[PDB]
């Protein structure tokens, strides 16, 4: 099927000083590229195993498929969630949905930050949409487990809290990284994902 | 491209009184049949997701593939591991490998029984072969997770400790079920699986 | 400092024909009794490890504590969730909360049944209360993992889908067990647990 | 009981150029210190919960206890596994045990490197001793899960492959970090741990 490393919609240094250029260059051109390359290799092996009816080979390939496939999914959403145009607060029905489900935008900020900072090891903090219940929901995913594939929630905004996402600039202080990322959140993209959920 | 429910190599009541006919009939004609049918349904869904490059659908289908695919793998080995002619002790290279790696046949029995009984919830106890290290190994698998697909060990002898495998006859006393199953272990089949590792 | 096996609030045969007396007698007098006894044994071992500062022993004891501690918690709620007088529909604020969060009582029944039946292996289906969001929530727990300890939800109604809870009467047909248990649900007790959240 | 951050047996820059001083200072004075502080807080909460017979609170505290307790255990072993005196090959019975169980020292190096590099997300690569089987064994542990508490193996040599252990110096190239760490392995300490296993 071939999965490809998507181009960035902005310069590597466009998010400075909140996220420096060296992190962006390494995160995109090294980490994400590795996920896409290993995903294509894994998908080809699974097609061969599925054709043979080799159930053992299919099951043995599941960790690599979820890890590299999730890494591709999560990082491709992550780039669209950020923008040099970003920051501030959302508007329209997204802001009102945040008000109804979390109380206020400031309360939503506190809960997503707490879930992000609270991740033990590598993982992701997500703002998702619960199509069954019809409200917003915050969830944390370990390693590269993708939100929709594992929980059914529709991903709206993701925060990478892998150490490679901040350590070069913020060292061990994960909260400092979380506080700075709010300044480059592309709320236009987050609203477009939310409206796609709505009828 | 079908996986099929294998026929039993013996009558449903051939293992009495150690395992009664109603358990054997239900385990084969109901439980195993459900695993194979759901495995075929799941495999077709995965082929559609794989053809479209839908990574989210591939990851969402992994629990059903592992559960039903493992259930088919585990139970098809299980039927060949039993025989009305079985019981006693193995001979040839199998017995010497057991003594070399476990000390004695009786201690091997105790170690596999302890791992079986120790399963919290549903699972399987396995005697496996480590091709890398070239010795025997005992492992426990949760639910329907298959041995080779999840651990790399080659399955030689498996003990189903799902409650459906003994509850109708032995109720909550799992050790009573474990003591009786040694009387119908098909050491001929276990020897052939062990020799398949050797070359 | 003992945890004790609670007495049943009804006769072992009081739930017939929906759940027969032999299942109730075995589930309470054998399964639950084993959980409480092993919980007390495990709690004493942890006190010794905790007093010595043995972190390795504390971590090694975690599976036994969660399994037997959860087994005690889950089953003691389970007995109070059932009654020979039960069945029908709840009234008061409970019914309005169910309609508000699920649409209707019948759809809530379908959603809890689907989560129950969908458990791969041993586990529990739960109706819980999310104190943070202030609405009802359905969750599934594996093995004996308790609802509040692992998810933070307050347990209101639990459905045991371990095979020992139905196999003697309904064999492999889990949906048949689910359909009959609605006839003895103690909505009075579920209402009291729900009101305990309210204040 | 109080757990304390152990002093380093060497200068922060004593492992240069293989591991630079800034990584060592951050790894010890920030990461490990956080594990010890959170472990003491968690241990105090568990003592209160155990005294009350609060099983739910005990189970809710298990992730924090394993994560911070394991972080303390793993890092306290890690510092003793490294030395400016280190590098080269082991001698005596340790080297012969490596020869018998892995074929050669070079083959052991390849297998431990592969397990380290193969960790998906945060984790550890371990050389352990299997007291039951009486041979050496390589295992990988996720996040801060300690070796002995989770697997029963006695830890001899540990390799931290959390991104905070190498990213400042080696960026995304985990193999470059693994190749350099062999030059500072304290084989004297590893042999002392191995002989403590022997009668
Ligand atoms: Mn990343
Ligand atoms: Mn079975
Ligand atoms: Mn039960
Ligand atoms: Mn570390």
Residue numbers in the entry:
A (entry chain B), B (entry chain A), C (entry chain A), D (entry chain B): 0 to 198
Question: Which of the paper's sentences describe this entry?
Answer:
Human manganese superoxide dismutase (MnSOD) is a CPET-based oxidoreductase found in the mitochondrial matrix that reduces ROS levels by eliminating O2•− with the unpaired electrons of the active site metal. The Mn ion is coordinated to inner-sphere residues His26, His74, His163, Asp159, and a single-oxygen species that could be either H2O or –OH (designated WAT1). Trivalent Mn oxidizes O2•− to O2 (k1 = 1.5 nM−1 s−1)8 and the resulting divalent Mn reduces another O2•− molecule to H2O2 (k2 = 1.1 nM−1 s−1). The second sphere of MnSOD harbors five residues (His30, Tyr34, Gln143, Glu162, and Tyr166) and information about their protonation states would be of significant value in deciphering a catalytic mechanism.
To visualize the effect of the electronic state of the metal on the active site protons, all-atom, D-labeled neutron structures were obtained for Mn3+SOD and Mn2+SOD to resolutions of 2.20 and 2.30 Å, respectively. The two data sets collected were from the same crystal treated with appropriate oxidizing and reducing chemicals and the redox conditions were maintained during each data collection. For the oxidized resting state that is described by both chains of the Mn3+SOD neutron structure, the proton bridging His30 and Tyr166 appears to be moving and this suggests the possibility of Tyr166 alternating between an ionized or protonated form and a deprotonated or protonated Nε2(His30). Nδ1(His30) is also observed to be both deprotonated or protonated. An SSHB is seen between WAT2 and an ionized Tyr34 while Gln143 is in the canonical amide form hydrogen bonding to WAT1 as a –OH molecule. Instead, the MnSOD neutron data suggest that the proton donor to WAT1 is internally sourced from Gln143 without the direct involvement of solvent and cannot be Tyr34 due to its observed deprotonation in the Mn3+ state. An ionized tyrosine residue at physiological pH is unusual though is potentially explained by polarization from the pronounced positive charge of the metal. The rates indicate an important role for His30 k1 that may correspond with our observations of its changes in protonation in Mn3+SOD. Starting from the five-coordinate Mn3+ resting state, Mn3+ acquires an electron (in reality from the substrate superoxide) that coincides with Nδ1(His30) acquiring a proton from the nearest solvent molecule (the crystallographic position of WAT2) and Tyr166 gaining partial covalent character from the proton of Nε2(His30) to form a LBHB.
